[PDB]
Design a protein around this ligand. Structure first.
Ligand SMILES: O=[N+]([O-])c1ccccc1O[C@@H]1O[C@H](CO)[C@H](O)[C@H](O)[C@H]1O
Ligand SMILES: O=[N+]([O-])c1ccccc1O[C@@H]1O[C@H](CO)[C@H](O)[C@H](O)[C@H]1O
Ligand SMILES: O=[N+]([O-])c1ccccc1O[C@@H]1O[C@H](CO)[C@H](O)[C@H](O)[C@H]1O
Ligand SMILES: [Mg+2]
Ligand SMILES: [Mg+2]
Ligand SMILES: [Mg+2]
Ligand SMILES: [Mg+2]
Ligand SMILES: [Mg+2]
Ligand SMILES: [Mg+2]
Ligand SMILES: [Mg+2]
Ligand SMILES: [Mg+2]
Ligand code: NA
Ligand code: NA
Ligand code: NA
Ligand code: NA
Ligand code: NA
Ligand code: NA
Lengths: 1011, 204, 193
């Protein structure tokens, strides 16, 4: 049969889909969500054997274990056990595109399990097996007899084993095909793996059972009254003595209960459903569910007899909330949402695509701690526990069908073809059937990157028809097609249009107002967090706040899809595309997360946290106005802390309880802040602290912050008469300056400061030179590759211009002695293929105090690409333990990504000054720095800097962080100016004009002195 | 042009048409018809089938056609003749002036149907005036209505030709047979003859 | 298999649907809607045998004409030739309602034809068979090898026979099932044939 090369066969003998069941036989257990004796896990140790194709599978395997098999844990992806390599390809399918056929060499995983079954399960009722996730298709045999087949790697497949099992020991055999016609619908940008990767279980249900149930909650105009309506269907023999009771509980309190015999209302000329019943329960003043306060009730559905004997019970958590689009706005409980979302793939660096509760809870907690209120299931239905957790912790979810055909040409080749309508419809319909009772799901999505075809239009209407309670979205075909209730583009910029033909990506602000357009706009993916990125994140947030119809978005994405590999000494390291011998591959494009694979945050997460704050502040005089962005709760677990500091030196602070209604404001008068006897800048910092711990945060959690510069007192105080005067020694090749136990040497042919001594100790490993380049970020590189250069990428514009090859030419080097100091003057030109790219003019003035004042004036040819930076650099001979600076921090910050950083005095171990991006590049800059301390040196001025054991050269020559090695000494990069990092996307230049170094002439000055 | 989908005998009538497991099967009956007949200018309206209730499968298919071929309206009478799966109010046997208010799927007088609150579509009976035996009494009352009301745009008489079959007697003489005459049972007897013309084309 | 008791399988190896084709190799003929040499009719006399269920059909029939078969005209409805009774039921299904199953006694018509194919059709190009109407479902074999399956009694089912024919005489074998899961969607008020 070759059922795995026929989109017309997506399954054989598979049971209908339905919401999570457990068949409790005790109502209270159902109410409490406790473990059910009728639902057994078959997870654990299985037998497994790998074959290169299904044809190679021995027939004996159906009857008995293969001696060559191994014993492995299930769920798992077999690539993670080393049986074959996982492949990282983004768009291009991992197999030849020739639908619906798959390669003849098709890795086949033969899993088997010998286990026991009690007669009690067989003597009555139905015993089914449930495979929550099998990638990508499989055949199932039980005791050597063929049971059935299933496709869709992301939804459960269940089969009735009642007639196949026997009391005692039984054997399951499952042949899993890596590739199948299902693969053409699974072209998501993620590792391509396979296997039994989600749970396997056995479920026992009575012959007469609850086969489906749907819960709806409708409200009156102000949400002070609701009706809970639960439709219940049965399978089995109808009998008049049968009943269904549906009860609603708020904790231990029973809120409502209704009982009815089967028999629905008349539907049409042939009657109604004799096998269904709908119970309707009124609820006054329901506690409403939202991500702010995830109030939940428990619905218990009991199937029983008139005399009271329970047959079985099913149940679910219920959240009272209405989701609707009106007048162009997405409302939840009648208030317009502001989605602070993120797309999250199911990824574990060691377990591959196998999810576990601990990881899930770790993700959720980090999300809520960082002010996210929503998640999109990019790009398939998730493991079932995820929805339970979103329901209870409180996150709005976009549940998305496992349909992605990105690699087709054109993208809608299959989605517009009716012969693929059935397979696609199963991917949508079965998801809705399984997840429609979860209150956390607020929007359905038809899949991802599959163009726009008529099949999407058919399925969009199917959903709208079956479940009017939730909007339907879909980005394919241009983001605003007839298959979406929400304009949901990916990577559309804030102000800049990208008018691609047929599927233009307009500026979001302009998109909203195109002729005839009225829908809300929520980006399905925005701000690509690959490497050092998130530049321009604030721009989105300012627009979402200013424009009602701009309702937010899902950042791309939560966690890097890096996998762990082990070196020669068995040490682990983070790998990406190509690292398993997979080819073609898309290299580092699999790492786009706000957190690394092991959940440590990237610095960008803090920028997200800050922009997504729920409290806004303005300052006026001594007055602070706090405005709450919560729609439903009062700030009842919040206090405001404030502190006033001069140049990092705290002068005063205090705290004020916050009591602001949702959407309201609170004024807070700060007490008279005394004046200050000292030059410097006074800064006010406020933080919102949650005094009490919550289900997702600890006591003392800071949820928001903001700063303002208050007065500044410029220094007008004259240094003081130098104790001594520096001496200049001139030789043919050098200018030397001596002062006390310090000496500076300037080489007359190079024109740079080549050496500095403190006593007899040399302080430099390489001379102090201008630097106009940076080891390229992922955003600077984009898609450019040696085999296919993208001449438009920043890195290629820089290379081509000669930025990385340009050599300094001396134009001038002079020394003069002044009354109290020595002045060195230098000028250099940087040229390439005879063009002058940059000209740097400087003065060094060394005085009686031993301070060295450096002034730098640079010219940049208007016709060369704007440079990555304009600074100086050097390799210091010293290695010191800490770094202390008065500037923005404490974490890495760049020009277009520094809103979350605060101006203060920070002190960190040197290694915290380096960001271990998997793919190395320029990293760890801190901007807005007035003073920097390292070892006995001190630099003062107004600059940006980074300091670490790695040279730019090394970072730009190294592709994996595990291969970097500390160089002798410390590399110090001190910049007058640094280009933004961008990140709107990572494949097209995205650094905003206001963040490019295009002024033509730049000036900066620093004072180097000994401390 | 009408898809080969009729599940009249189910209880309730949309049992299959509302079941996603039957969407595939239904879908091919509709998509394969459009793919075959879309270039004929005589086809001016597509129909989703007949007496199959109103199920979500119908809504999905209605949309698919609207999407693939916007040139022709889509109609479908199931579920009450004015559901969200039809561009045309297309009842079967609705009377001219007399309402028949059956529960869930009332059959209003056609004059009154047009003007129900919120209604604005054209009304063309998918089936009207049952030509079984000596019949067509009251035919003129429809025509008078069709002519006076712009939005009453006519209808399709039920039906063209009797489905009687020829049998031969003892003497070899042919005779017109109906339900049960072949030993078929259960059967619906003469309900198979409702045409304006006899099976041999002779007019009634 | 029992593909006829599974709404998940409405066809196997069937080609996509499309408007009426004739593959004219002369433009003026296509202009005038004249007959095309590339579109041939298989209508006329075929061999036919009736069985009470698919389980009763002999394997011999795939490769060899059944001597007891009769010669009858195609197209036709087998009730009209007297092999079984046509049934007139309006609403009530003619079979017990238990989708997607059908009765185990399921009248099966085994039709077959030996016909010629010129080498010219085989040296190049594609040769497909087109059944404009088969009620209600069927399996098709060509020269004893299985080709495919189809449902929906009112639309054409087409199969590529390019790899199955040979120049000269060829034999088709079509096993037509009276009832199938397709029957649940064919409850029109008319004779059931
Ligand atoms: O879709 N593409 O053909 C394509 C080509 C070059 C770069 C990105 C790109 O598509 C983009 O890839 C990113 C990578 O993280 C995401 O997968 C995103 O969904 C996709 O649109
Ligand atoms: O898809 N990618 O992630 C990716 C990374 C680096 C280079 C090319 C690449 O994908 C490639 O991008 C080009 C656009 O430049 C095309 O869209 C191509 O089909 C895609 O495979
Ligand atoms: O559909 N019915 O249940 C039903 C019951 C009794 C009488 C007619 C009837 O249905 C009507 O029957 C006529 C008979 O020629 C047509 O088939 C019409 O389409 C159907 O609605
Ligand atoms: Mg298949
Ligand atoms: Mg993609
Ligand atoms: Mg590559
Ligand atoms: Mg700020
Ligand atoms: Mg009768
Ligand atoms: Mg079938
Ligand atoms: Mg021969
Ligand atoms: Mg009927
Ligand atoms: Na907004
Ligand atoms: Na990616
Ligand atoms: Na408070
Ligand atoms: Na690098
Ligand atoms: Na009229
Ligand atoms: Na009739």
């Amino acid at each position: 049969r070759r059922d795995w090369e026929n989109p017309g066969v997506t399954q054989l003998n598979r049971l209908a889909a339905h919401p999570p069941f457990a068949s409790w036989r005790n109502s209270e257990e159902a109410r409490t969500d406790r473990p059910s004796q009728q639902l057994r896990s078959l997870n654990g140790e299985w037998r497994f054997a790998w074959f290169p194709a299904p044809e190679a599978v021995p027939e004996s395997w159906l009857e008995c274990d293969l001696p060559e098999a191994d014993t492995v844990v299930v769920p798992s992806n077999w690539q993670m056990h080393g049986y074959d390599a996982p492949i990282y390809t983004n768009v291009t399918y991992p197999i030849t595109v020739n639908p619906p056929f798959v390669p003849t060499e098709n890795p086949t995983g033969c899993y088997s399990l010998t286990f026991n079954v009690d007669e009690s399960w067989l003597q009555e009722g139905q015993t089914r097996i449930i495979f929550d996730g099998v990638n990508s298709a499989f055949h199932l045999w039980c005791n050597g007899r063929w049971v059935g087949y299933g496709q869709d790697s992301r939804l459960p497949s269940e089969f009735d084993l009642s007639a196949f099992l026997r009391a005692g020991e039984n054997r399951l055999a499952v042949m899993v095909l890596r590739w199948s016609d299902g693969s053409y619908l699974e072209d998501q940008d993620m590792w391509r793996m396979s296997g039994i990767f989600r749970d396997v279980s056995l479920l026992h249900k009575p012959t007469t059972q609850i086969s489906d149930f749907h819960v709806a909650t409708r409200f009156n105009d102000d949400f002070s009254r609701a009706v809970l309506e639960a439709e219940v269907q049965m399978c089995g023999e109808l009998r008049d003595y049968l009943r269904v009771t549906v009860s609603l509980w708020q904790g231990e309190t029973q809120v409502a209960s209704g009982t009815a015999p089967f028999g629905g209302e008349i539907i049409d000329e042939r009657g109604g459903y004799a096998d269904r019943v709908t119970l309707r329960l009124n609820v006054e003043n329901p506690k409403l569910w939202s991500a702010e306060i995830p109030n939940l009730y428990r619905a218990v559905v009991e199937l029983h007899t008139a005399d009271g004997t329970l047959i079985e019970a099913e149940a679910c958590d219920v959240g009272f909330r209405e989701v609707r689009i009106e007048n162009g706005l997405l409302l939840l409980n009648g208030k317009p949402l502001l989605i602070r979302g993120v797309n999250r793939h199911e990824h574990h660096p060691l377990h591959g695509q196998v999810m576990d509760e601990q990881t899930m809870v770790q993700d959720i907690l980090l999300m809520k701690q960082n002010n996210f209120n929503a998640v999109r299931c990019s790009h398939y239905p998730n493991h079932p526990l995820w929805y339970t957790l979103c329901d209870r912790y409180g996150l709005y979810v976009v549940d998305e069908a496992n349909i992605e055909t990105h690699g087709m040409v054109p993208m809608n080749r299959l989605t517009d073809d009716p012969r693929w309508l059935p397979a696609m419809s199963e991917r949508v319909t079965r998801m809705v059937q399984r997840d429609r009772n979860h209150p956390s799901v607020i929007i359905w999505s038809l899949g991802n990157e599959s163009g726009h075809g008529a099949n999407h239009d058919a399925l969009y209407r199917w959903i709208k028809s079956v479940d009017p309670s939730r909007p339907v979205q879909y980005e394919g075909g241009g983001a605003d097609t007839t298959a979406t209730d929400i304009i949901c583009p990916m990577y559309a910029r804030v102000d800049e249009d990208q008018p691609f033909p047929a599927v233009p990506k307009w500026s979001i602000k302009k998109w909203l107002s195109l002729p005839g357009e009225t829908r809300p706009l929520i980006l399905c993916q925005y701000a690509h967090a690959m490497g050092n990125s998130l530049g321009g994140f604030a721009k989105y947030w300012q627009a979402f706040r200013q424009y009602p119809r701009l309702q937010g978005g899902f950042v791309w994405d939560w966690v890097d899809q890096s996998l762990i590999k082990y070196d020669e000494n068995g040490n682990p390291w983070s790998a990406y595309g190509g690292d398993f011998g997979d080819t073609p591959n898309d290299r580092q494009f699999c790492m786009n997360g706000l957190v690394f694979a092991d959940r440590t945050p990237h610095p960008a997460l803090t920028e997200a946290k800050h922009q997504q704050q729920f409290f806004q502040f303005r300052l006026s005089g001594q007055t602070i106005e706090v405005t709450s962005e919560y729609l439903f709760r009062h700030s009842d677990n919040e206090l405001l802390h404030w502190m006033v500091a001069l140049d990092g030196k705290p002068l005063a602070s205090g705290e004020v309880p916050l009591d602001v209604a949702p959407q309201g404001k609170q004024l807070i008068e700060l007490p008279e802040l005394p004046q200050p006897e000292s030059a410097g800048q006074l800064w006010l910092t406020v933080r919102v602290v949650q005094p009490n711990a919550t289900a997702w945060s600890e006591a003392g959690h800071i949820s928001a912050w903001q700063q303002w510069r208050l007065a500044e007192n410029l220094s007008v105080t004259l240094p003081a008469a130098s104790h001594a005067i520096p001496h200049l020694t001139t030789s043919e090749m050098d200018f030397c300056i001596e002062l006390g136990n310090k000496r500076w040497q300037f080489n007359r042919q190079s024109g740079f400061l080549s050496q500095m001594w403190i006593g007899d100790k040399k302080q430099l490993l390489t001379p102090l030179r201008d630097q106009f380049t940076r080891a390229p970020l992922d955003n600077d590189i984009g898609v450019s590759e040696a085999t296919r250069i993208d001449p438009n990428a920043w890195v290629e514009r820089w290379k081509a211009a000669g930025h990385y090859q340009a050599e300094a030419a001396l134009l001038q080097c002079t020394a003069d002695t002044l009354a109290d100091a020595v002045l060195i003057t230098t000028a250099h030109a940087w040229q390439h293929q005879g063009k002058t790219l940059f000209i740097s003019r400087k003065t060094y003035r060394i005085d009686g105090s031993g301070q060295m004042a450096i002034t730098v004036d640079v010219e940049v040819a208007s016709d060369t690409p704007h440079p990555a930076r304009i600074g100086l650099n050097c390799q210091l001979a010293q290695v010191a333990e800490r770094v202390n600076w008065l500037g923005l921090g404490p974490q890495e910050n760049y020009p277009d990504r520094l809103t979350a950083a605060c101006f203060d005095r920070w002190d960190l171990p040197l290694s915290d000054m380096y960001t271990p991006y998997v793919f190395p590049s320029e990293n760890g800059l801190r901007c807005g720095t007035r003073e920097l301390n390292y070892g006995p040196h001190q630099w003062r001025g107004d600059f940006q800097f980074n300091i670490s054991r790695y040279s730019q050269q090394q970072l730009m020559e190294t592709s994996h962080r595990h291969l970097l090695h500390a160089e002798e000494g410390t590399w110090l990069n001190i910049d007058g100016f640094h280009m933004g990092i961008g990140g709107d996307d990572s494949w097209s230049p995205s650094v905003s004009a206001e963040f490019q170094l295009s002024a033509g002439r730049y000036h900066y000055q620093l004072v180097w002195c000994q401390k």
